[PDB]
Specification:
This protein has 237 residues and is an alpha/beta fold. α2 crosses α8. The chain has nine helices and 14 strands. The chain is elongated, with a radius of gyration of 19 Å. It has two domains: 1-95 and 195-230, 3-Layer(aba) Sandwich (D-Maltodextrin-Binding Protein, domain 2); 96-187 and 192-194, D-Maltodextrin-Binding Protein, domain 2 (3-Layer(aba) Sandwich). The strands form five sheets. A five-stranded mixed sheet has the order 4-1-5-14-6. Strands 11-8-12 form a three-stranded antiparallel sheet. Pfam families: SBP_bac_3 (PF00497). It is found in: Cell envelope.
Length: 237
């Protein structure tokens, strides 16, 4: 039947997801499809009493796939920030929130984006966080990426780096040796929220997904899933 009918009649919902992007949607070492985004969707499905089937495809196919009706829903860290994409898709209540954070040495007293004006700040010169550092008046120290940026902070050849909350938390959880720490996080209004994406004209279906999401937010489940994949609740804006 239609999506809302299948949701209401304990039917089957199809979800597009990449399966090649840890810790969001990936194959664990036994082969199981898991990750933050897959596990949220499994718990949402369980709230609505619906069965879920994941359809694994790469990003560019995922979206055309959704629009073309190859699945009902897409789950893949999609914030849908572009006004142009908002005219073609609807997004549920977000089940996770990410934004810029500031990382410095364990010995550091930096606190804000103001504290790095003129400071040595490790970034890739052509990355979106490079532009942010340079805009904030930082002295850029060139690296290729996150691991190299923290190596430099460890060696004291840079004092700070700007990057994404969830990339950083994922790195610090796998590398607890770090010796570095988040000293600032963008406030709520600077954060981007990821949600289940569906085609236009499914308002009743989205409301249900949102409602299930909020249910999972309040009964503790999203907090359990954030702690498992990131060491933190990532469900709060």
């Amino acid at each position: 039947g239609s999506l809302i009918e299948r949701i209401n009649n304990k039917g089957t919902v199809t979800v597009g997801t990449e399966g090649t992007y840890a810790p969001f949607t990936y194959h664990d070492k036994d082969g199981k499809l898991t990750g933050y985004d897959v596990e949220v969707t499994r718990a949402v499905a369980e709230k609505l009493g619906v069965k879920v089937e994941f359809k694994e495809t790469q990003w560019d196919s995922m979206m055309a796939g959704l629009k073309a009706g190859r699945f009902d829903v897409v789950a893949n860290q999609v914030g849908l920030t572009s006004p142009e994409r908002q005219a073609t898709f609807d997004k549920s209540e977000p089940y996770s929130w990410s934004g810029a954070v500031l990382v410095a040495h364990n010995d550091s007293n930096i606190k804000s984006i103001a504290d790095i004006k003129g400071v040595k700040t490790a970034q890739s010169l052509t990355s979106n966080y490079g532009e942010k550092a340079k805009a904030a008046g930082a002295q850029l120290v060139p690296v290729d990426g996150l691991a190299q940026s923290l190596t430099l902070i460890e060696q004291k050849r840079a004092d700070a780096t700007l990057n994404d909350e969830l990339a950083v938390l994922d790195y610090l959880k796998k590398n607890p040796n770090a010796g570095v720490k988040i000293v600032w996080s963008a406030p709520a209004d600077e954060k981007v929220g990821s949600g289940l994406i569906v085609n236009k004209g499914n308002d009743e279906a989205v409301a249900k997904f949102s409602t299930a999401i909020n249910e999972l937010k309040a009964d503790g489940t999203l907090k359990k899933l954030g702690e498992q994949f990131f060491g933190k609740d990532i469900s709060v804006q």
